[PDB]
Amino acid sequence: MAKVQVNNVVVLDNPSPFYNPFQFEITFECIEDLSEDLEWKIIYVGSAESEEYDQVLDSVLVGPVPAGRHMFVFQADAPNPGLIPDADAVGVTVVLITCTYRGQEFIRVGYYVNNEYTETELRENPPVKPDFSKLQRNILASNPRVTRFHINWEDN
Amino acid sequence: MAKVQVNNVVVLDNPSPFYNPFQFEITFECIEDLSEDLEWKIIYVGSAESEEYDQVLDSVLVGPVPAGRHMFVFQADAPNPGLIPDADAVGVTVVLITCTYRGQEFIRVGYYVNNEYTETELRENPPVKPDFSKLQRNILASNPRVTRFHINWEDN
Amino acid sequence: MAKVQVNNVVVLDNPSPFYNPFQFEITFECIEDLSEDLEWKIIYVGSAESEEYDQVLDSVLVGPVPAGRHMFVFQADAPNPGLIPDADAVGVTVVLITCTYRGQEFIRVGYYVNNEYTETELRENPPVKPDFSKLQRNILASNPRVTRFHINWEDN
Amino acid sequence: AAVLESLLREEVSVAAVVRWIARSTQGSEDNAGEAAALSSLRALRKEFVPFLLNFLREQSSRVLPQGKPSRRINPTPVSEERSLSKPKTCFTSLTDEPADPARVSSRQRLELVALVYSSCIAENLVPNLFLELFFVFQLLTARRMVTLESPLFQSIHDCVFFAVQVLECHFQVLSNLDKGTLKLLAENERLLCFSPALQGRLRAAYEGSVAVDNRANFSSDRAFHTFKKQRDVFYEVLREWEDHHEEPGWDFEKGLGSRIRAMMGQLSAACSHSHFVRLFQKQLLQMCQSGADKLGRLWRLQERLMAPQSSGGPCPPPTFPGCQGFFRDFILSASSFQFNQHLMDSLSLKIQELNGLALPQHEPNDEDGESDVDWQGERKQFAVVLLSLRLLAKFLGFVAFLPYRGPEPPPTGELQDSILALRSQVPPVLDVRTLLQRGLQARRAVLTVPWLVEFLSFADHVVPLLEYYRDIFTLLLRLHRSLVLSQESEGKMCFLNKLLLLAVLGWLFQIPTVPEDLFFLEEHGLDNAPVVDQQLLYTCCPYIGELRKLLASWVSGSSGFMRKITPTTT
Amino acid sequence: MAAVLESLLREEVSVAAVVRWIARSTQGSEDNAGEAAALSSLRALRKEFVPFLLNFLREQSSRVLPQGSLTDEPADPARVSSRQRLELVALVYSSCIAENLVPNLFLELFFVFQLLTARRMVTLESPLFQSIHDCVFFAVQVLECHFQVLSNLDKGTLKLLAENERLLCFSPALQGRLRAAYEGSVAVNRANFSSDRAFHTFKKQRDVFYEVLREWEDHHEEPGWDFEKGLGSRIRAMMGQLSAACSHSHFVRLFQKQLLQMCQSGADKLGRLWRLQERLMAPQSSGGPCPPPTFPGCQGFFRDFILSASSFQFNQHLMDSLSLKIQELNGLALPQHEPNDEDGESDVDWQGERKQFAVVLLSLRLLAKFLGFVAFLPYRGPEPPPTGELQDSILALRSQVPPVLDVRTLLQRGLQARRAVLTVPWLVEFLSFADHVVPLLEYYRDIFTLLLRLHRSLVLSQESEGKMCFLNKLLLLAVLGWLFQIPTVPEDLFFLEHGLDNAPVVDQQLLYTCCPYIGELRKLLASWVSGSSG
C-alpha cells in the first residue's frame, strides 16, 4: 500500500551527443500525503566491470506531493568522461534512475543507453583513444526495465 | 361506469392430457363496493349442433367484493362423457366463461379448443367411437372476445 | 446449485369456510432443463399431537420443465373432517406444501392455518362437538416458513 | 446362495453360524459336522451378511413399490399493480386386503430367515441397526404386491409375518423409543393380529412411559474501532438473516455475500481475525445449541415445520438444521483463508477444552428423592457439554476438509498412490485419533465418540484410505462391534448409552463417503452413568423418528395416477 | 556495565579472560585468581555486556558516520590520539566477532568497513573517535585479524580492497596478503482427470494460466503495471472455476513444476550485456547486510499470484504439495566425491555432483520460502507481541494447530546425520516469513534454541581434520546471522541464557547466490572510490 506509485517514463532527448544532459519525465501518482521530501537520484554506470566507476549525476529533493498525478524534470549534468574507462566508453551501458524516501530506495526505473560513433569513418576505424566530443548517446526508451520493492510508509 | 371490469383471464396448463380440470386465473377490477355477489359460471360446448348437449361444468359465486384489483383461480372438472353424442366433440369446440351479476349476464369469452388425440395412429385412422383414453383438450387459442352488455346496475 | 428455485407463494382466498378447496400460486424458477417431473404434495396436519392424522390432500406431477421462470396452481380437495380429532378441529394447525424430485424432497414451504367460528355465539359458546359447516379457515399468508434441503440434480 | 439354502435346510443351526461369523472361539460343544461345514465355507465368509442383506433387498422389491350454486371464492386482495395482473388486449375400486397370519406360505422358511436376520442384527454384524429396523418396519407396513426359485415373499402376509417375527426378539430397543412411536406400535392392528403378546408388552411400556471488551486486548486504536464496526456489521447481518431466512426466494449469497466479503476484507486488513472468531464461536454456541396449552400446541406445530427432510431414510447425509445453517453459509460465503484458519484454531481449542472437562457425576448412593435437583443438574450439564462438543466438531470437520470435499469419488484402483502420498503429509487439524484413544481408555466414549462422528461425517472420499483415518475407522469399528444390546457385566455401560453410541456409529458407517466394504473388512468415569436420556438420544440422532413416521404414514394411508399439469412459461 | 567497560579499558582484566567469560567457557587451572574472582562477581552483569558494547560503538560512530571549498584530509596513522584505548577496543571487538558472540558476522564486518570508509565528521567521557584517523585505525586493526573471511570473498571485492589507499597506509602486510588473494583468485493424461468434462476444463484453465503468465512476462517491468488491477479478476475466476470441478491438485502440480522450472533458472557484447542485466536486478541497494525477506525476479510473480488468488483451496493444496516436495528433496542421497588421489581426469565428476547439490539446495530454499510464505500468511501482520501478560490466551490458541511441516524433526535429523548444509538454509528461509508471535511457542522456541546452539558451535578458526569446510561454515554462519537479525525474531532471543556436510559442496557462486548481501561489502568500497573522485 505504497503512498507513491510510478507510471510511464518518457525520456525526451533520447538522441544526443555524449555531453548533453539527461532529461526524464516521470509520472508518479501519490495516493495520500507524505511527511518528508522525496529524494531522486541518477546513477550512471561508468564501467560494466564493477561499481567502482558509478557516477552520481545529481540528487534532487522534491516533495510538494498532494495526492494526484504529478510531474517535474530531472535534468542532470553529463558524466565526466575522464573517469569512465577506455573499453567501456565505446560499448553499450545502462543508466539507473533511483528514488528514495526517508533514505530508503523503492524504485529503480532503468534505461539501456548505447554509445556509437556518428561518422562512418569512426565506426569503420574505432580510435584507440575515445573522442567523446563526437560520440552519440541513444537511450532505448522503448524497453524500460523497472523493479519495485516494498517499504514501510509509516509516520515516523 | 361499470363497477366490474375484467382485465385478463390467464389460461393455466394449456397443453393438457384429457380429464384434466380446466384452470383459469382471472383478474378483475372493482371501483365501488357493490353489495351483492357476482356469479361466475363456465360452459363447455359438448356438441356444435344444439345446446341440449351443452354441459354446465360449474357455477361459483363470488363475494364479498370490496373495491380494488382482485383475482382468483378457478378449477372446473372434466366434461361428462356420458352425454357425448359422437366424435363431433373431438372437433374444435368452444369453452366460455359468463359472470351473472344481479342474476343477469353481461359478458362472454370465446376460446375455441382443438380437442386433439395423442397417438399418431389415432390421427391417421381415428376410431368411430369417441374413445376418451387419449385426447388433448383445454388447448385454448388465447382469443379474448368480450361481448359487453349494458347490464342494469340497480341500487336495489 | 439447485436446478429448481422457488420464490413468493401466494395462497389465494385465505379467508374461506372449512370446505373451500386450497389455492396456491407458486412461481418456481428453473435454471436449466429437467429430465423428469417435479412431484408436489399437500400435507394437512389434522392434529398437532402426531402425524397419525396427517391427510395427503392431493399429489400433482409437474412437467416437462425446461429452463425459465414458471408458475402454476395446486388446487386440492379440502381435508376430510371425519379424520380430524375433536379437540384439534377448533385450534390452529399447519399445512405443508412439499416438492420432490426423483423421490427426493428439496422444499417444504409451510403455512400456519387457523380455524375460527364466524358467528359470535359459537365463540362465546364453543360446542362440544365441532360442526364443520360453520367454521372459517384463515391461512396466515404473511408469515410463510420455508425450509430448503440439498439434493443431487444429476442426469441419472 | 448355496450357504443360505443349506441353512434353510436346517443342516447348520442359526446360532452356530452366527457365532462362527463373529469369529468366536470354538467351544467343546461344537458339532463335528457343523464345524467342518463352516470351516469349508470359510472361503465364502466375510460376505455372507452382505449377501443376506442384498437378498432381502431384491426379494423386498415385490413387497414395496420400487427401489344451482357452488363453492365461493373470496378473491384475494392482492392487487399489486404488477405482472399479469396488468390490463391487456380488449378485456377492458381397490379394496384393502387385511393381513392375516393364516394365509402364510412356507412358514418354516420365513421363520428361519427371520431368526437369522434377527440374530445378525442383534450381534451387530450389520453396519446400521436402525437401518435394518427401518427396513423391518417397511416390511411391516406393506400395502400390496406390485406386478431358491420360489420367491420368499408370496404375499403381504409373508412380509408382515417376517417383520413381526423379527420385531419379537427386539423389545428393549423398541421399549426405549419415543412415547409417540410406542403409542403407534401399541395401537397397531397387525401386531395384535400376528403377535398379541408383543403388542401387550408394548402397550404396558407405553403406559409406563405415559406415567412419567477493552483497549488492552486490541492492539492499537484503529483496530479497536474497526473491530467494533465489524461486530456491529456481523450483528446486523445476523439480525437480517433471523428476520429473513424463511421467506420464499431469500438466497443467502445474493442477500449477504457482498457484506460478508467486505467485512472479511476490512477485518483481515487490521489483523483482528482472532477476536472476531472468538465472537463468532461464542454466538454459534449460544444460539445454535439452544394459554399454556396454546403455547405447547404452537411448539408442536413449530416442530412440525422444521422436521428434517422427509425423503431421507434412517441414514440421512450430514446437514445443518436451523440456525446452524446460517453459520455454514457464512463460512461458505466468506471463502477466506485467514478466517478459516482462525476458526479452525478456535474450534480446536474449544473442543480440546470441553472434551477434557471433569463433569463429576452423581454417586449412586441411597434412593433418596430429595437429591432430585442434583441428578437433573449433572445430567443437564453433561447434555449441554456433549451437544456443544458435537456442534463444534461438526463445524471443524466441515472447514478442515472443505478444500478437499467434492463430487470426486475415489479416482481409481491404481494411479492414486500419488494422491495418498500428497494427502498424507499435512497433519490433521485436530488430533482426533489420540483424543479417541484417550477417551476410550478413560471410559468416556459417550462423550468422545459422538463429536468424533460429527467431525468425520464431513470427511472426503480419500480420507478412508489414509493410514491415520483408516486406523480411526478401524477403532470405531471395533468399538461398534463391542456394543451388543443384550449383555451386562454389572456396570459396563448403561443401555441408553449403548443405544446412542450404536446409532451414531451405524449412521457414520452408512455415509456415502465411507466405503461399504470398510465395515465388512477383516477385523468411575463419565461413562457408565445415566447421563443420556430419551431427549438426549433423540437430539443427537434425529432420524430414529423415521420409524415413528413410517407407522404414522401407514395409518394415514389407511384412510386415504396423479396428474400431469404443465408449468406456465415466463 | 559501564564499570566493566572501564575496567577492561584500564587493563585490570585481560581481554581474553572477559571474552572467555562471556562464552561460558570452562574455568581452567590457568585462570588467574583476581580476574576469575572479578568476573565471577560481575557474572550477574553477564549476558548484556556485548550488546551494550555494540551500542557504545554505534553511538560513538555517529560522529564519524553520517546519520546512524572543502578538502579531503588524508588519513594517516601518525596523528592518532589515545592509540592504546583504540587498540584495546579493537582487540576486544575482534575477539568478540571471532567467537560468534555477535548475531550476524557480516553485519559487524559491514560496520567495520563503514568505519574504515568514513568521509568526514558531521557536527570514558572523551569520545573514542576524535577523527577519521581513530576510526580508520580501529577498523584496520579489527580487519587485520579477519583474513580468511576476506580471502574467500568475491574476486572483485578483493580487488577493490587491494587498491584501497587507507589499507596500504595502515597495514602493508595485510595488503600484500589480499593482493596475493586477488592474484590467485583471477588465476582461476486422461487417467488422472476424473470424467471428461473436468479434463477439458483443466485444459482451459491451464491455457488461461499460461496466458496470464505470458502477459506478466511481457508486462511486469513497464512503469505503472500493477499486478492486482492487471490479473486479479482472471486469477480469481480461475480459482473459482477450478474449485468448481475439484481440480486444484493438478493445477498446483503444474504451478509447482513451473515455479521450479522458471525461478531456479558479439559474445563479449553478450557477456557485458549479461553483467548490465544483473545490474538491473541488483538488490535493494538501500543498505543493510541483513535485508528483510523478499522475492527477487520471477519468484515475485508467484507471490503476487498467491496474494491475488486468496483461495483457501488452492492455498491448502499448494501447502501440501510444497511440504511433500520439500521432504522428498531433503532426503536425496547426493553422493559426494570421495577425496582419493589427485588425478585431474575425474575433473568433470566433481562439478557434476557439486552442481547437482547446488540445484537441489536452491530448489529446496525456493520451495521452503513459498511454504513459509503461505503457512503463516493468515497470522502475519503489524501486531508485535501483544504485551507481557494477557497473551497466554493467544499462545494457547496458536499452539494447538500442528505445524504445516515438521521442521523441528527435519532439522534434528539433518543435524544428527551431518546434513546441516542442506537442512538449515531452507529452514532459515522458511522461518524468515514467520509472524511476531511465532518466536514464543515451545516448538519454535526449541527450534530457535537449537539454531542458536548450532551457530555458537560454528567458529571460523578451528580445524580437526575433516569437521566442516570453511566455506560451508561461512554459508551457515551468514544465513543464521541473517535469520537472527529479522525484526520478527526478538533481539533478546540470541542473548538468552563422511556425510554431505563434511565434503565441500558450496562454492563462491553458490555462496553469493544463497546470500546476495555479501556484495554489500564490495558496494561500500565502490561507493568510496566514486566519492573519492567526486
The 3 state secondary structure assigned to E355-416 is HHHHHHHHHHHHHHHHHHHHHCCCCCCCCCCCCCCCCHHHHHHHCCCCCCCCHHHHHHHHHH
- The phi, psi pair for E83, rounded to 5°, reads -60, -35
Chain D residues whose beta carbon lies within 8 Å of the beta carbon of residue C24? none
The domains found in chain A, sorted by start residue, are: 4-139 (2.60.40.1490)
d(CA E174, CA D462) in angstroms, rounded, equals 66
DSSP state of D133: H
Contact, E295 vs E262, CB < 8 A?
Answer: no
Query: D336 touching E, CB under 8 A?
Result: yes
Chain D residues whose beta carbon lies within 8 Å of the beta carbon of residue E381? 271
d(CA E257, CA E263) in angstroms, rounded, equals 10
Quickly count: other Cβ atoms within 10 Å of residue E315's Cβ: 23
Report CB contact under 8 Å: D421, E249.
Answer: no
Method: cryo-EM
- Residue D557 in grid coordinates: 394411508
Contact, D426 vs E404, CB < 8 A?
Answer: yes
List Cα–Cα distances, E212 to B44, B113, E233, E307, in angstroms. Answer: 68, 61, 11, 15
Task: Fill in the amino acid letter for D317.
Answer: P
Contact, E398 vs E445, CB < 8 A?
Answer: no
The 3 state secondary structure assigned to B87-100 is HHHHCCECEEEEEE
Query: Which candidate from E320, E323, E397 shows the least CB-CB separation from D274?
Result: E397
Strand partners, A138: A15, A114
- From chain C residues 23-42, the ones with a CB under 8 A of any chain B CB are 23, 25
Chain E residues whose beta carbon lies within 8 Å of the beta carbon of residue A116? none
DSSP state of B20: P
Contact, D389 vs D354, CB < 8 A?
Answer: yes
- Residue E359 in grid coordinates: 540445484
Query: Which candidate from D69, D81, D89 shows the least CB-CB separation from B144?
Result: D89
Cβ-based neighbours of D530, under 8 Å, separated by 6 or more: D379, D494, D496
Query: E254 touching D, CB under 8 A?
Result: no
Query: Which candidate from D247, D562, D564 shows the least CB-CB separation from C146?
Result: D247
CA-angle at E355, arms to E433 and E452, nearest 5°:
35
The 3 state secondary structure assigned to C91-139 is CCEEEEEEEEECCEEEECCEEEEEEEECCHHHHHCCCCCCCHHHEEEEE
Q: Residue A95's closest CA among A111, A75, A74, A79?
A: A111
Report CB contact under 8 Å: C73, B72.
Answer: no
Handedness of CA B119, B121, B124, B129 (dihedral sign): negative
Q: Which CATH class is domain D272-290+314-362+374-552?
A: mainly alpha
Query: Which candidate from E223, E285, E526 shows the least CB-CB separation from A6?
Result: E223
- The phi, psi pair for E130, rounded to 5°, reads -85, -25
Got the DSSP string for D366-406?
Answer: S--STTHHHHHHHHHHHHHHHHHHHHHHHHHHHHHSTTT-S
Cis bond upstream, residue C64 (ω within 30) = yes
Handedness of CA E240, E241, E247, E253 (dihedral sign): negative
Query: D253 touching C, CB under 8 A?
Result: no
Query: B56 touching C, CB under 8 A?
Result: no
Report CB contact under 8 Å: E397, D217.
Answer: no
d(CA D505, CA D502) in angstroms, rounded, equals 5
Q: Residue E113's closest CA among E78, E61, E70?
A: E61
Question: Which residue of B lies nearest to C62 if distances are taken between CA atoms?
Answer: B13
Query: E529 touching A, CB under 8 A?
Result: yes
Report CB contact under 8 Å: D79, B70.
Answer: yes
Neighbour-count burial of B121, counting CB atoms closer than 10 A to its CB (0-12 exposed, 13-18 middle, 19+ buried): exposed
d(CA B98, CA B109) in angstroms, rounded, equals 7
d(CA D543, CA D546) in angstroms, rounded, equals 5
Query: Which candidate from E192, E323, E377 shows the least CB-CB separation from D425?
Result: E323
Quickly count: other Cβ atoms within 10 Å of residue E246's Cβ: 17
Chain C residues whose beta carbon lies within 8 Å of the beta carbon of residue B66? none
What is the distance, to the nearest Å, from the Cα of residue D449 to the centroid of all Cα atoms in its chain?
Answer: 14
Query: D341 touching E, CB under 8 A?
Result: yes
Report CB contact under 8 Å: C25, B23.
Answer: no
Chain B residues whose beta carbon lies within 8 Å of the beta carbon of residue D565? 12-13, 16, 20
d(CA E248, CA D363) in angstroms, rounded, equals 55
3-state secondary structure of E178: helix
- Residue E349 in grid coordinates: 565428476
Cis bond upstream, residue E103 (ω within 30) = no
Query: Which candidate from C13, C25, C75 shows the least CB-CB separation from B75?
Result: C75
Query: Which candidate from B13, B63, B66 shows the least CB-CB separation from D566?
Result: B13
How many inter-chain contacts (B to C, CB under 8 Å) are there? 20
Q: Which chains touch E (3 or more CB pairs under 8 A)?
A: A, D
- From chain B residues 14-43, the ones with a CB under 8 A of any chain D CB are 14-17, 20, 25, 27-28, 37, 39-40
State the smallest CA–CA distance between residue D218 and chain E in angstroms. 8
d(CA D555, CA D184) in angstroms, rounded, equals 9
State the smallest CA–CA distance between residue E269 and chain A in angstroms. 8
Question: Which residue of E lies nearest to D344 if distances are taken between CA atoms?
Answer: E401
Query: C118 touching B, CB under 8 A?
Result: no
Query: Which candidate from D344, D346, D422 shows the least CB-CB separation from E249?
Result: D422
Neighbour-count burial of E91, counting CB atoms closer than 10 A to its CB (0-12 exposed, 13-18 middle, 19+ buried): middle
Chain C residues whose beta carbon lies within 8 Å of the beta carbon of residue D76? 10-14
d(CA E68, CA E58) in angstroms, rounded, equals 8
Terminal alpha carbon distance of chain B: 17
- Residue B106 in grid coordinates: 353481461
Helix (H) or strand (E) holding E155, with range, is helix E155-163
State the smallest CA–CA distance between residue E280 and chain A in angstroms. 7
State the smallest CA–CA distance between residue E447 and chain A in angstroms. 29
Please identify which residue in the block is written with the cell numbers 443427537.
D540
Neighbour-count burial of D182, counting CB atoms closer than 10 A to its CB (0-12 exposed, 13-18 middle, 19+ buried): buried
Query: D403 touching E, CB under 8 A?
Result: yes
Handedness of CA D513, D516, D518, D523 (dihedral sign): positive
Contact, C74 vs C24, CB < 8 A?
Answer: yes
d(CA D225, CA E16) in angstroms, rounded, equals 56
Query: D562 touching B, CB under 8 A?
Result: no
- From chain D residues 279-298, the ones with a CB under 8 A of any chain C CB are 294, 297-298
Task: Fill in the amino acid letter for D134.
Answer: F
Query: E229 touching A, CB under 8 A?
Result: no
- From chain B residues 58-97, the ones with a CB under 8 A of any chain D CB are 58-66, 68-72, 74
Got the DSSP string for E415-449?
Answer: HHTT-HHHHHHHHHHHHTT--TTSTTSHHHHHHHH
What is the distance, to the nearest Å, from the Cα of residue C101 to the centroid of all Cα atoms in its chain?
Answer: 17
Contact, C132 vs C19, CB < 8 A?
Answer: yes
What is the distance, to the nearest Å, from the Cα of residue D325 to the centroid of all Cα atoms in its chain?
Answer: 17
- Residue D518 in grid coordinates: 470398510
d(CA E479, CA E488) in angstroms, rounded, equals 16
Helix (H) or strand (E) holding E85, with range, is helix E83-98
Q: At what angle do helices D273-288 and D323-334 cross, to 10 degrees?
A: 160
Report CB contact under 8 Å: D340, E312.
Answer: yes
Please identify which residue in the block is written with the cell numbers 541497494.
E285
Q: Residue D502's closest CA among D183, D114, D125?
A: D125
Query: Which candidate from B5, B68, B74 shows the least CB-CB separation from D73?
Result: B74
Q: At what angle do helices E49-61 and E105-116 cross, to 10 degrees?
A: 30
**Farthest CA pair distance, chain C:** 59
Helix (H) or strand (E) holding D253, with range, is helix D252-269
* Sheet with strand B104-105: strands edge to edge: B55-62, B38-44, B95-101, B104-105
Neighbour-count burial of C71, counting CB atoms closer than 10 A to its CB (0-12 exposed, 13-18 middle, 19+ buried): buried
What is the distance, to the nearest Å, from the Cα of residue E467 to the centroid of all Cα atoms in its chain?
Answer: 22
Q: Residue C26's closest CA among C93, C71, C89?
A: C71
- Residue D175 in grid coordinates: 421399549
List Cα–Cα distances, E160 to E165, E186, E289, E524, in angstroms. Answer: 10, 13, 18, 10
Report CB contact under 8 Å: D219, E319.
Answer: no
How many inter-chain contacts (D to E, CB under 8 Å) are there? 82
Q: Which residues of A129-151 are buried (b: 16+ CB within 10 A; e: fewer)?
A: ebebeebbbebeeeebbbbbbeb
Mutate to test the interface with D, among B57, B62, B71 (most CBs of D within 10 A): B71
Query: C73 touching B, CB under 8 A?
Result: yes
State the smallest CA–CA distance between residue B111 and chain D in angstroms. 14
Contact, D523 vs D481, CB < 8 A?
Answer: yes
DSSP state of B106: -
Contact, D424 vs D460, CB < 8 A?
Answer: no
Task: Fill in the amino acid letter for A148.
Answer: R
- Residue ranges covered by each domain of chain E: 2-146, 329-337+349-520
Helix (H) or strand (E) holding C39, with range, is strand C38-44
Chain D residues whose beta carbon lies within 8 Å of the beta carbon of residue C85? none
- Residue E309 in grid coordinates: 488468488
Strand partners, B71: B27, D76
- Residue D519 in grid coordinates: 465395515
Got the DSSP string for chain A?
Answer: --SEEEEEEEES--EEETTSPB-EEEEEEE-S--SS-EEEEEEEES-SS-GGGEEEEEEEEE----SEE------BPPPPTTTS-SHHHHS-EEEEEEEEETTEEEE--EEEEEEEESSHHHHHS--SS--GGGEEEEE-TTS----B--------
d(CA E418, CA C13) in angstroms, rounded, equals 87
CA-angle at D548, arms to D544 and D552, nearest 5°:
155
List Cα–Cα distances, D497 to C81, D175, D382, D456, in angstroms. Answer: 43, 15, 13, 20
d(CA E304, CA D48) in angstroms, rounded, equals 58
